[PDB]
Symmetry: C2
Subunit: 153 residues, 2 copies
């Protein structure tokens, strides 16, 4: 029933399109698409609380974390709602995404419609990097590309 999409865009080579689908409001959200222009390896993949309020915004903005948990991996009970972990780019810089998440939703309090999907500069350390910043952002670094999550055809 509920379907959504984010077009990932930035001031750079990184671009992609990520689809969200959730057949029942109690069910998982299937997340699939691909991102190109990435450096080989892992890149943080997070939902941030707000849409851009400026042209050519560089900041990622706060993580989507309505329950005020510490940053973790998507498998962890202790995590932000928006903690979707890492996408993996191949040697050509293409990252094909195919995950399922039961913490994000496309409806209700934890709805990510109207929020921002961001692929990050560096790998998300999943809260296990051993410093204060690890429990906030996973040390994923800067926003390479982002898109507001919108309703999809």
């Amino acid at each position: 029933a509920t379907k959504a999409v984010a077009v990932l865009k930035g001031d750079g080579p990184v671009q992609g399109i990520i689809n969200f689908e959730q057949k029942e409001s109690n069910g998982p959200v299937k997340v699939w698409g691909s991102i190109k222009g990435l450096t080989e390896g892992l890149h943080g993949f997070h939902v941030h609380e707000f849409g851009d309020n400026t042209a050519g915004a560089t900041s990622a903005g706060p993580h989507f974390n309505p329950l005020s948990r510490k940053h973790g991996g998507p498998k962890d009970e202790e995590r932000h709602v928006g903690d979707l972990g890492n996408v993996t780019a191949d040697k050509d810089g293409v990252a094909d995404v195919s995950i399922e998440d039961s913490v994000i939703s496309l409806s209700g309090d934890h709805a990510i419609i109207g929020r921002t999907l961001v692929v990050h500069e560096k790998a998300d350390d999943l809260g296990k990097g051993g410093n204060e910043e690890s429990t906030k952002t996973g040390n994923a670094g800067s926003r390479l590309a982002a898109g507001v999550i919108g309703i999809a055809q």
Copy 2:
């Protein structure tokens, strides 16, 4: 209060930032901001049903019309939910937007959050254009700039 924001982006010089605010969930939505890079005169200003599912999309898709009405002006009872009429650009090509609307909402089943705000090539004829396309789109023409309506800080 519910707040939203759309960053209107295009290929040409047309760009803008439009804010939405709704003090009461059954009250009017305040729409304000500014658009620049426009030709002097009236430009169609509509909420469309879907967010882009492609990079560099040139088409504004279907109008957001969940109640299946005919196209009209914002003051008409016969209108789409997304029929916000026209904005007016001065001789410097800048349109100061200051609207209030009681058909659109930022919440509920027919919330515009996650939909696309689009500024169009030419004036909306408000359904009074004298052909079939008039009662569908108001003949406002191509999309000049667009943005997904996201949640605002």
